[PDB]
Symmetry: D2
Subunit: 234 residues, 4 copies
Amino acid sequence: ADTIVAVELDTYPNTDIGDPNYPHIGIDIKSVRSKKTAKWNMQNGKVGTAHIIYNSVGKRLSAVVSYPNGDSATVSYDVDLDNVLPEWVRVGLSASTGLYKETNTILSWSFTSKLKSNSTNALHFMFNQFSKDQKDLILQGDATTGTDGNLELTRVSSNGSPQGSSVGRALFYAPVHIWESSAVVASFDATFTFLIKSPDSHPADGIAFFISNIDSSIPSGSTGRLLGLFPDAN
Amino acid sequence: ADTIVAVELDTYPNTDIGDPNYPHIGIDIKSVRSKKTAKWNMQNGKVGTAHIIYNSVGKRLSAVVSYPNGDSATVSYDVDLDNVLPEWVRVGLSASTGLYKETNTILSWSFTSKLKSNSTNALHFMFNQFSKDQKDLILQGDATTGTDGNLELTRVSSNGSPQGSSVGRALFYAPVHIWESSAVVASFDATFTFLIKSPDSHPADGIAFFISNIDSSIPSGSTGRLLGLFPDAN
Amino acid sequence: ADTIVAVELDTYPNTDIGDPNYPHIGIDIKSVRSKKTAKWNMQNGKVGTAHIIYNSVGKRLSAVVSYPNGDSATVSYDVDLDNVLPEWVRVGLSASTGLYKETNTILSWSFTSKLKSNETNALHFMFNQFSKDQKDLILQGDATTGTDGNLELTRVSSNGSPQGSSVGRALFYAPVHIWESSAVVASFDATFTFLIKSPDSHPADGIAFFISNIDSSIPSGSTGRLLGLFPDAN
Amino acid sequence: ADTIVAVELDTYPNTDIGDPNYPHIGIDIKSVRSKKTAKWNMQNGKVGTAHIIYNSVGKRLSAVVSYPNGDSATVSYDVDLDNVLPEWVRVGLSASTGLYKETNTILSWSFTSKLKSNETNALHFMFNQFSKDQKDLILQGDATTGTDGNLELTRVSSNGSPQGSSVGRALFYAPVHIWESSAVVASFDATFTFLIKSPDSHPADGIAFFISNIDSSIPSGSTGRLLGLFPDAN
Ligand SMILES: CO[C@@H]1O[C@H](CO)[C@@H](O)[C@@H](O[C@H]2O[C@H](CO)[C@@H](O)[C@H](O)[C@@H]2O)[C@@H]1O
Ligand SMILES: CO[C@@H]1O[C@H](CO)[C@@H](O)[C@@H](O[C@H]2O[C@H](CO)[C@@H](O)[C@H](O)[C@@H]2O)[C@@H]1O
Ligand SMILES: CO[C@@H]1O[C@H](CO)[C@@H](O)[C@H](O[C@H]2O[C@H](CO)[C@@H](O)[C@H](O)[C@@H]2O)[C@@H]1O
Ligand SMILES: CO[C@@H]1O[C@H](CO)[C@@H](O)[C@H](O[C@H]2O[C@H](CO)[C@@H](O)[C@H](O)[C@@H]2O)[C@@H]1O
Ligand SMILES: [Ca+2]
Ligand SMILES: [Ca+2]
Ligand SMILES: [Ca+2]
Ligand SMILES: [Ca+2]
Ligand SMILES: [Mn+2]
Ligand SMILES: [Mn+2]
Ligand SMILES: [Mn+2]
Ligand SMILES: [Mn+2]
């Protein structure tokens, strides 16, 4: 199984697998059942911003999701990622729908990773516009880019309607060096803006920023509550 | 009173005012009496690196100090800086000597702050060399710069010989908008490299990175254990 | 006199002082009389973006001004700024109105300066919103800060309408070390977004990004065609 | 064949193929025969820095190569890369040896590409230490990674001796979006530090930073004067 650290923006409460009964942001460490969640007021059809921060000094994985009206939800979990993640990973964005659905539209994604020692190795990318053939993104499942400049992680119908039982992921093409024993600080941060729209009656299932082994694939069956991240709900 | 937030590399244990009984790094919140410390093996005549990171989402100010052999000390303190600093600040470096002395040489200093809302105000500077006329630094007390390219926070001689009763600070010329009520993320980091050397009976007193009100001055009598930071040891 | 290097977005053809007979972008080297210009179609009440780029290696100061439709104007000038500017400078934005007028609104402004080596000193700042008390800007003449979150280089009424005979500049608070004789690469770029609106018979006079001596102030009578920049039109 | 834009640090004058009769830095556009060269004083066994700058405003490809004593050589060629390079590329470093040889040691390599506005897509990577298994570099031919934390583009023998008839290249793993039609500015810059040592008399053949089609590979026979870049000397 892939190893997954994710920040989930979870729109649909799966209380049978330990979701709280509200939409929530969560920190997931090798389980879809978040280690820490904060209640999240998903603003339907508004553009949200998620920021994700981690460094190896504080070892606190933090996320905020905010919308321009000012509503933000924040979650943090102290976790030593040296002990969770492979040294080398791919970073990505993941989303899913199951019985219920939503557009899981990414409008921008930025990532910076650094390994500082005494004084740096670093990777930074930013996408504000996704291109039709976006050669530095590995698109998995139903994930599609361009020409509107967005990344549609999951299926949107011609008529604009999001489709259920969809999953897709974008991963940055290059492997990322997320920790290195000799580094005194390893840090990463990620930001993405997203547009979750549910016309129908209930948004599902959510969007995750995730970090995984290099060869990470969509686990078979990982539509719906599994967010394209996990093979099961353990 | 000035309002002070600081990461001290405290080379001298003033156990009468609450220092631990060893050299230490410490996180100073409006008091010289650190809210958290970690034992710090200061490596005499070696070039050390301090990295300070504050994570507005995680609300955690962290610092590591390391030397090239790999030895590091780490300290984090859980704090919301919105509740501490004013909105506008100066950032700087401070050092002092007292009855015991050391060089407090800064070889480099970088700083980044970001104030985000949705889809940012930022400031970033980096010094890798300090000119004799370093116009974007407010030198206070005994801080000089140049010509060896270094910033000397406290008096040192001609031939490298540290002086007692010395207090010096360098603040960045521009004010920094370090938080704002409407910032989703108000982060900063800073990195400095330093050379503390002493042939004394004991080194004293330390270097601090600090954030203060804009009009912040060296408090009267803040040589020694007060680190050029604080008016008294409360 | 001050020493001035500027990129002007000059909305008003002052053909008696060497402007071309159309709105234009220009590169001003110690003179309001551009060393090079390109015809610029200023789009009234649209948000335009100016990007300024200099490197010490190519010795070429380049500017583009665009608007969201794709319409751009470009100017480059071959010049060694080591030969023109003092080592230390302030960078800023300037605008003026004269007998004719326009809003000279700045919606964002960034700047990055790097001096290597042979490590790197750098300054970067980023304004995407301007505060009512924007402490890290020196406002001169009729420059306000906002809300509307904006920087109003010249007097406009709270109810949008620009004023004649107005001059205003914003300089970043810190001096910038823009070149140094022992720098291998002394480069900078700036970008600003702006909104020029006029209901006048023409718009005038324009906006400039400028680099000046540290103690640079608006020269007496540099409203109008002088762009707040120059004491005369030589 | 592959399409190549390169900046060459050419240590060995190949006068039968239009090299000047001195070591030189050169700008190569789709030919090993540089469009523009500058005499370069290669300082044997010293750590050099090459900086390479391009933006699509000035359209000036510039490069400096410097050593810490302060000697630098600069070369620039106005060239419109939109008409040379495919939209998506890989960027890399290349070196070769032929009859004569030198170590072609890379101690650091950084790269930034940006596509602004009209907002930003950007890639930035920074390598100060190369790792034995550097998963974000595509190593071709004889390029190893250490440790020592260095990239050896071409073969160095056990006894330190650089070998002749070596060629190797490192390319960054991710494709880079070097130009995009709707972008207002497409810029890149690259820097790398290198240590060219010739035990044997007699340095050859050089080091290039190059930009290539994504699937670019070492042309057969591109040891020696072809720098791992070109199939022939046309
Ligand atoms: C010899 O140790 C000293 O004890 C003195 C007698 O109590 C006292 O004055 C102390 O302080 C001076 O020196 C230290 C180290 O430089 C400073 O931390 C103090 O502020 C003071 O300047 C010292 O413990
Ligand atoms: C009617 O247009 C004007 O002609 C006037 C005739 O002398 C003269 O005052 C001009 O200048 C004022 O207005 C322009 C545009 O605002 C400025 O460029 C000048 O410096 C001056 O303030 C104008 O051509
Ligand atoms: C109406 O709520 C649902 O009950 C269904 C019957 O058991 C169940 O299948 C459904 O789960 C599906 O949809 C969820 C919301 O999209 C998703 O998280 C699941 O993985 C699954 O697709 C939900 O429990
Ligand atoms: C002594 O000079 C050499 O003359 C040789 C005659 O055959 C020739 O092979 C040699 O070129 C080879 O080495 C160069 C230096 O490394 C290299 O640029 C060539 O590609 C080739 O390997 C040089 O001309
Ligand atoms: Ca769920
Ligand atoms: Ca102390
Ligand atoms: Ca004019
Ligand atoms: Ca050659
Ligand atoms: Mn959940
Ligand atoms: Mn202490
Ligand atoms: Mn003009
Ligand atoms: Mn050549």
